[PDB]
Design a protein around this nucleic acid. Structure first.
Length: 257
DNA sequence: TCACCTGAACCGGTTTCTCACAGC
DNA sequence: GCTGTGAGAAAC
RNA sequence: ACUCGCCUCAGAAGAUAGGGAGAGUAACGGACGUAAGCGUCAAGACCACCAGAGGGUCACCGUAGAUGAGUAAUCAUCUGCCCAUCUAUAUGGGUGGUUCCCGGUUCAGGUGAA
């Protein structure tokens, strides 16, 4: 009983810039998680090959690896959540430290060197939390796809191994869930945006949508079949933004009931 | 590279807490 | 001049 | 002067504008520079800022009214009328105004121009 209403957006400069920033953040986090998981996997299977070269049964060493999970950190694999707490927010704070130490008359290069890290300036905390966690969702999904293709579940052809994302090679998209503010005609604006300055407080036609911190954006379609379906016992569930060429699209996932 | 299709498979977030209010 | 609403961070 | 179309703005097929083309009295093919490449330009109406940049509205919703929101341009909500469309036993209703739209996320092919 699930449906998708997909509209082609018509954003302005100040919103296209934010959309690029969001997709860049999701790509960055996906790359981080995939790289970490890849390194841990390489260590894991090198150890496995070394142990199997001496005729060791995997069933017996299963308990050894289980005990090693509570012994060494580098022998564990993580989900979308644990990586955010253990790893993501430490460099969130590190980027913050660089930002509030740079203005105090000190050298930008020593605190932030372009060699080790590619960013000109720290930014891993001034990005929306949901956008960042979207990449964690995507990467956890990819690695679960791979590990299910291997072991016993995903019937079909062998689904590769997780692969890095690169600008201009992969697809740009992210998903924002409920219960944050989003909706069609009949929903309020956001405090502080330039439209809210002019005084608008509600949506009063069929050519605007509410997108979290991004504000309200116009569309090319008509939101009427949404709102008419909205007033039937159906409520919006989440929204996904995507890009193709130089065009942006948004899908509202609708759950009728 | 950047981009586009086929093609298999499987699937479509919840909650707590802090805080800065807009509006008189 | 202060505070119930909204907006958002953070864990999971 | 008239008929045919290659790329481009209109969510996608049918209606209406853009930069250049063609031939005669349908076929054929995007353009500017500056073998490529790479950069650039191609939808009209209203308020702002100092010719041009940024922001809002439409390019889907017969044909009549009224009421609101908006400085506006447009939009929304009710009542008519016509048409189409169905619905159960000449009937009543309900459903609209040129048709359709279910999408994710990854891995692997395949071509494809560069």
């Amino acid at each position: 009983n699930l449906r998708a209403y997909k509209f082609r957006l018509d954003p302005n400069q100040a919103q296209t810039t934010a959309l690029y920033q969001a997709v860049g953040a999701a790509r960055y986090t996906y790359n981080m998680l995939t790289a970490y998981n890849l390194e841990v996997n390489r260590l894991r299977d090198d150890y496995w090959k070394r142990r199997h070269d001496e005729d060791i049964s995997d069933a017996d060493i299963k308990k050894e690896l289980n005990a090693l999970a509570k012994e060494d950190k580098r022998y564990k694999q993580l989900n979308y959540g644990a990586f955010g707490t253990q790893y993501l927010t430490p460099e969130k704070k590190r980027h913050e430290q660089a930002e509030h130490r740079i203005e105090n008359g000190e050298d930008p290069s020593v605190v932030w060197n372009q060699e080790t890290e590619r960013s000109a300036n720290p930014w891993l905390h001034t990005a929306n939390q949901r956008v960042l966690v979207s990449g964690l969702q995507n990467a956890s999904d990819a690695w679960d796809n791979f590990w299910a293709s291997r072991t016993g579940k995903r019937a079909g052809r062998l689904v590769g191994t997780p692969r890095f994302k690169k600008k201009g090679v992969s697809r740009d998209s992210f998903t924002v869930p409920a219960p944050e503010k989003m909706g069609a005609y009949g929903t309020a604006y956001l405090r502080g945006e330039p439209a809210y300055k002019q005084g608008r407080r509600k949506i009063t036609d069929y050519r605007h949508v509410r997108l979290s911190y991004l504000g309200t954006i116009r569309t090319f379609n008509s939101t009427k079949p949404l709102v008419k379906a909205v007033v039937a016992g159906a409520k919006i569930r989440s929204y996904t933004v995507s890009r193709n060429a130089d065009r942006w699209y948004v899908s509202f996932l609708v759950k009728f009931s």
